[PDB]
Design a binder for these strands. Structure first.
Lengths: 778, 743
DNA sequence: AGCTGCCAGGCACCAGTGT
DNA sequence: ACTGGTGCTTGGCAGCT
């Protein structure tokens, strides 16, 4: 094995290796003219991942270099491939002109494509958030931060325990997760997509505070309410540095940061989120979820917002009551607003590409199309009687000048890129129109030159054409080649044809090519000028898009409440849930059968229901719908019931061997009289009574000590004695029965199921006999 | 409805629902890569290349290496329902193994599907039991006329070259024949070639094998773990076969334990005999490869040069294998040695006919070796003659002109040419006729160059045509021996399976089980063949003593998988004994076993709204209805999932029935102490248990089976470890005493 | 409409004219 | 040091059919 030496490498590889040294662990697209190339292991790994060929490059001194590459113009196709596989990619471009450059051309990494920092439409998921996130652990606790780089929505939290930290990850579901080398709880993180093991120095608190205050243009972060969250700031700092390092542009759209403090929302553990299937069914998909029923939003940003709302039920009554008002007010105007709102589209993500200076002509056209809907929406919303709605109407904005600007500046349906020109509309720039008229002037001249020359020569096959390689030409067929005029200079030969050039033709070639080149250059300059004109209003536009997205969510939840017959829940002082004709919002929609509605009456005096009765999904649905009604009430939506009075709820536990006892312990430790606890048939014991013993003791603890609002489904008939012994406990039972009755389950229903299951009549009779023997002694 | 790949230039496009369904299945927003994806998911695909469909690949009828799964069977199957019962048929189109059955009830029909697991399932429009088939891959709703009996008998007798099917032992089975007919027509319709490799058909009779229901197959994880994959299965441990066909055979064996003692004893003999020669045979056997599937592509006339090269390579191993196996003392082994064959002429034929490492296709030629055909060699020499002339023409013309950039090249469009660079274009000779101009170069032609172009192109064309003819000639020469070759591949595959099971027995320390007259199982130092391998901890071996006098064991104690493993390993030992393999134990005496029932593991609902507890009681009912004194019954903690007394009452009544009425060999795991009274009341019942050691800060669930009932309850101990408040545990400990002391 | 194969623009390389 | 050929990934499409 030979000894490598940087001085022995060719200037190109010297340049490459110096750049690659800055990105050892990730793939580097070193630009070489029209191709983005890769070398050594990068080439080997790329050829496997991207399904491209692996070749070599010569070196007279040394061994040949593994090579692989792709044309620059098809880069987005391959970035998509790598990003879906969780691979980061460094984009190294050519800076400086090879004509002027003596050695290899100067080459900087201009950006780094990574799963959590993508802002391109083609790589992103329309109705799904894509979050970069950072996670930090301390001797005192955890520190978390997330960033939607396409909206600049930057948040921060400081979970106390891993149970809350696991819930954060479940809820937020980051696409790329930064973490410290010294992270203790790898179990939380291991086997996650987009893992990024960062060095411990990036989570420095003094740099984080410095770097965040720099970004936000503040001297202290007291205003953002994150000043006393150092664990969070350490994560936020690490994240912001990464975000910057990958984009390598200024990130103006990241204006603020927010503490998400647990007391402000209804806490839900990871299991409880999955059991309630809020945005994700138990099988993994999105069908038959609460979101699948509620989300009929017309814009992607609205869809994404509503999903965030569902996972973060707010506890702030002022916010809740304002949503209810807005929902009631907008019910008559849903048909009117929604068609117009639809035309605004995903303005949120368009503005990110504006902020990053990556917005393509279609983005600005869609942005222009969105501005055109604004006067219409303002007209509709003026008559709506709500302070919340009028606030949104105000925040929504009008942007008349910008609407006008883009109407003038860009054509009706522009191309996908500016690269080839044709984006800018005529009349916007006088210099540009002149250059285009010169190009079309030479176009005309050349057309009349064709008919002139074929007349003048008398050769019917005589044509005028253009070749990218050889320029303009006069083509004559093989048969008539000999009759070409003296002044025709042959420029190209084909099998059945000959092509010539004359000074007149060459003169207007130079005319049209310089004209087009001049125009193309001017479009690109005029296009970058639009960014300088629009970006001064970015904060106002970001607010508009936020108003428009929230307006979509509320108009949607207004429409859903009507179309699905929901009612407005009332809030009460004391803990309790009082549902009349309650329904499961998803099950009633997926089943074509009519849903059997049911009541619920939980109060401080009636805390725990022991739900005996047969095995089936009726119990689970009764319990789950109770949670989903509470959840929906606390996102400010209407709820699937005839009437609902609901008191404060601090968190929802939805429990449905040791894994059972751990989850039960989690409930007993963290539950409080403001908690909604849903438990299904715990009591897995080594023997006959040890499961019952714990089932008893937990129920006992949940009723006397914790006093949580508990639905406690069980098969133990022994637990139907709890109301006799304890204050606050009561019996209900489901009697396809599907209707909740007061009192305990009437039959002993195990043998009945065994009969249905097909156990021999003889065997059931001997059980029925044995059952009497057991009951008569006890 | 089939997916359609409408070709649009360089892309195969799809539209409407096809596009929607494709984007989901294929993970799209290189065709053979995606066909493989769809075929494994049981999807048919139409290939549209005028503008019309040239090919349709169907998941159950594929025979191409690139689409198939090397070590996995791929079965087309047909299912028929009748007022009298069910009718089933399956076909491995790559081996021509065609079978037929007539399940009496849906329980047996479900087991067939589970076991066979077809890649593409044909069914009649009037199928009553959708539940059996709904949500399965490769569903194909066929019209009811394809299941006609008179056409089936006609079409089958045509295929097999018989007038009557009495010889195949399927003459009686009309339901099966209806399915078999529907299937054969489909098979033919999509290959649309003669299918010579389909030479027979076979009825399988339940009494000849150990019956296993679907649940029991999945709970024993014979070839498929509970999660769906193939890791941590009995097959994952036993299958260290060197050929794919051997792998696939062994998997079939595991799912079909034979009851025929003669067959079993013959396998045991073969296994014992071959133990010293495993190191020797396996490296050679490996080089035979998947001859089974190569012969299908021969039979279908789709075999590519590499197939025949691999077939030639396989024939070369045969004399070596025959030499090794001659000294082996077994009638069974010598029978395989005979059936294996030698095919000396065919080996020689392919050595002469095809080059060492041929191309992937014949399309471009270069497959046939020189010396095989005199006409071909002449045509090649003429081509190479003009090749030489043109090569010397290059150096001649560049010398004569003095132009160093002067080259001679070839273009499909323009033919041969003399290329000169832009810089030296003006110095081209007068006789050079320019016919193509490039950016930095010019290309010309002369009559001498055009003359030898016609010479080489006609020569090559003549040769290419002759190769393709000589290649198709090889099929005409090989195919007459297809039946003999199919038997060889069958012998080679079975030899691989037995050599493997010989090697596994040694490497994994298995022993030969003995068979006894009366029902029983007597294991010494028994082990779970998978768990002992997956766990890096030492496996605690355990005995078992089940007889007619000791039929049922009530297994109380803590179940933290220790009970399930003790029970599952008992089944897997019985299963392995009855595929003729050695078994994971110090010693095993085993009596006749008619059926294995395994009510173990927690049963996921499939048709929901019926609980977990009913799934247990359904499987329980299946046991009580169908079990017999020759049955091995494994039950895990039934009574669980419903009221304390209700559950105990059934648990009692089932055990009672299984000990007195059925008298099956039963392992009955339970948490009810009350059931530990059964040995006092009933003759053939006894108590065993597992326990846990407690010392200091250490608590360990032991895996050792002890005689007598369980002493203690470890539920509260686990709850303590899990972190349930000390106060809550104390109140449970209090409540537990109250419950136990009353009863 | 269906193929070949030329070309895109980096850069290093090799071979024929430069002391 | 110079000059004018060579090679190299994949995709676009001219130039043939």
């Amino acid at each position: 094995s030979a000894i490598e030496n940087f001085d022995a490498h060719t200037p190109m590889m010297q340049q490459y290796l110096r750049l690659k040294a800055q990105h050892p662990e990730i793939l580097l697209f070193y630009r070489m003219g029209d191709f983005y190339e890769l070398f050594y292991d990068d080439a080997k790994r790329a050829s496997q991942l991207l399904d491209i060929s692996l070749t070599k490059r010569g070196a007279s001194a040394g061994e040949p270099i593994p090579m692989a590459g792709i044309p620059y113009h098809a880069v987005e196709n391959y970035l998509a491939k790598l990003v879906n596989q969780g691979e980061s990619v460094a984009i190294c471009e050519q800076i400086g002109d090879p004509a002027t450059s003596k050695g290899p051309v100067e080459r900087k990494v201009v950006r780094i494509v990574t799963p959590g920092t993508i802002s391109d439409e083609a790589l992103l998921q329309e109705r799904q958030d894509n979050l970069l996130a950072a996670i930090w652990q301390d001797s005192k606790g955890f520190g978390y931060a997330t960033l939607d780089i396409s909206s600049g929505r930057f948040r921060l939290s400081e979970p106390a325990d891993r149970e809350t930290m696991a819930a954060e990850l479940q809820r937020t579901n980051p696409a790329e997760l930064l973490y410290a080398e010294d992270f203790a709880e790898m179990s939380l993180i291991e086997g996650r997509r987009g893992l990024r093991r960062r060095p411990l120095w990036e989570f420095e608190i003094d740099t984080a505070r410095q770097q965040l205050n720099l970004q936000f243009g503040t001297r202290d972060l007291v205003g953002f309410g994150v000043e006393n969250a150092p664990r969070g700031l350490c994560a936020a700092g690490c994240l912001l540095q990464y975000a910057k390092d990958t984009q390598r542009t200024t990130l103006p759209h990241i204006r603020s940061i927010t503490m998400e403090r647990e007391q402000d929302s209804i806490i839900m553990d990871a299991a409880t989120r999955r059991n309630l299937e809020i945005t994700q069914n138990l099988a993994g998909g999105a069908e038959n979820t609460l979101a699948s029923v509620l989300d009929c939003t017309v814009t992607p940003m609205g869809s994404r917002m509503l999903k965030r709302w569902l996972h973060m039920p707010v506890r702030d009554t002022r916010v809740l009551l304002e949503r209810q008002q807005t929902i009631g007010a907008l019910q008559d105007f849903t048909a009117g607003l929604q068609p117009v709102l639809r035309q605004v589209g995903d303005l949120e993500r368009i503005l990110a590409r504006l902020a990053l200076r990556t917005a393509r002509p279609r983005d600005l056209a869609r942005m222009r199309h969105a501005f055109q809907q604004l006067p219409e929406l303002r007209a509709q919303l003026e008559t709506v009687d709500s302070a919340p709605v009028q606030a949104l109407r105000e925040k929504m904005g009008e942007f008349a000048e910008l609407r006008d600007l883009l109407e003038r500046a860009i054509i009706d349906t522009p191309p996908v890129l500016v690269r080839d020109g044709g984006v800018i509309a005529s009349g916007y720039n006088e210099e540009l129109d002149e250059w285009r008229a010169l190009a079309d002037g030479a176009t005309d001249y050349l057309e009349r030159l064709e008919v002139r020359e074929r007349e003048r020569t008398g050769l019917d096959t005589l044509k005028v054409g253009f070749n990218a390689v050889h320029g303009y030409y006069i083509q004559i067929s093989r048969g008539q080649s000999h009759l070409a005029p003296i002044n025709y200079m042959r420029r190209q030969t084909l099998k059945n044809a000959e092509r010539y050039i004359i000074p007149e033709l060459k003169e207007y070639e130079d005319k049209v090519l310089t004209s087009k080149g001049k125009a193309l250059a001017l479009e690109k300059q005029l296009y970058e000028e639009l960014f300088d004109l629009l970006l001064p209003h970015l904060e106002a536009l970001q607010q508009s898009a936020s108003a428009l997205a929230e307006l979509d969510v509320l108009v949607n939840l207004a429409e859903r409440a009507y179309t699905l017959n929901y009612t407005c829940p009332t809030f009460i002082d004391k803990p309790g849930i009082r549902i009349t004709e309650g329904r499961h919002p998803v099950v009633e929609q997926v089943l074509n059968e009519p849903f059997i509605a049911n009541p619920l009456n939980l109060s401080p005096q009636r805390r725990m229901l022991i739900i005996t009765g047969p095995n089936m999904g009726g119990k689970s649905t009764y319990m789950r719908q109770t949670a989903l009604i509470a959840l929906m009430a606390y996102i400010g939506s209407y709820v699937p019931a005839q009437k609902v009075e609901i008191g404060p709820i601090d968190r929802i536990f939805t429990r449905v061997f040791m894994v059972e006892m751990t989850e039960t312990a989690n409930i007993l430790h963290n539950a409080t009289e403001y908690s909604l606890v849903l438990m299904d048939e715990i009591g897995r014991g080594t023997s006959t009574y040890d499961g019952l013993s714990l089932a008893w003791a937990c129920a006992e603890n949940l009723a006397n000590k914790i006093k949580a609002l508990t639905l406690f489904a069980t098969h133990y008939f022994e637990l139907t004695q709890l109301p006799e012994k304890m204050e606050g406990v009561a019996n209900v039972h489901l009697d396809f029965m599907h209707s909740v009755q007061d009192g305990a389950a009437s039959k002993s229903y195990g043998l009945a199921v065994a009969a249905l299951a097909g156990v021999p009549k003889e065997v059931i009779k001997r059980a029925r006999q044995k059952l009497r023997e057991l009951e008569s002694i006890s």
